[PDB]
Amino acid sequence: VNSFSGYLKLTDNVYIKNADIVEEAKKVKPTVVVNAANVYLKHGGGVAGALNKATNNAMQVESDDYIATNGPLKVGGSCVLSGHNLAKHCLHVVGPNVNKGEDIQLLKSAYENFNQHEVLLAPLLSAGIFGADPIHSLRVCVDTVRTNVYLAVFDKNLYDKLVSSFL
Numbered sequence: 415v416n417s418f419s420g421y422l423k424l425t426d427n428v429y430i431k432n433a434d435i436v437e438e439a440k441k442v443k444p445t446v447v448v449n450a451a452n453v454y455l456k457h458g459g460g461v462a463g464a465l466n467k468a469t470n471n472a473m474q475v476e477s478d479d480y481i482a483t484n485g486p487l488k489v490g491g492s493c494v495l496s497g498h499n500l501a502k503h504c505l506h507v508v509g510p511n512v513n514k515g516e517d518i519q520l521l522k523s524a525y526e527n528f529n530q531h532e533v534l535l536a537p538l539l540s541a542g543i544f545g546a547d548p549i550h551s552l553r554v555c556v557d558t559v560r561t562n563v564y565l566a567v568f569d570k571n572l573y574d575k576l577v578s579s580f581l
Contacts (some may be wrong), residue, residue: 416533417442418564424580427562428555432573435461435537435566436468439500444564447497448528448536449473450544451506453486455493460543469498477506489516490523505531512545521551525558533562538576548572549579 418438421429431438439447450461455477457466466473476495487493492507509524510516524539538555540546548567555563567573 418535421564422577425556427560428565429563430565430567430573430576432568432570433566434568435535436464436500438535438566439497440468442535443501444533444535445502446505446531446534447501448534449504449506450537450539450542451487451508452511453489453508455481455487455506461537465500465504468500472498473504490520492527501535505534507539509540509544510546512540513543518546521546521554522558525555528559528563529561531561533564535564535566537566548576552576552580
């Protein structure tokens, strides 16, 4: 049992809610919140910009140290950093960015990172400003993630379309 509330069950292990991931995280304080990261951990926009702002830029400061020590992530890759005031941990996952010409086939590899965590609060990878089709991202999520994933979709119109088109 966990405290996630108001989710619709899509499959045994995938749940979805029309919610602001920042507010979900602040309320639930999950063990893991997923960030829609880029390889440089530059949290400027989309989900990353929102999560970082909610940490008053502490996520960015921590990320800058991570990059100085380790260098960039790979597309499809991830790292675990602090969740600050949002969660115990933040799993920074890099989905392909179609607006950078990156190969959407790497989306499955990106979602595989979720399987290293028994429970996650997450956005749909490669959606929003990353340019991929969110319906396809949800399909890959369902077909890749085996651990328990609670998806937060802020945009109500998109949420409704994701539910109504789910196979």
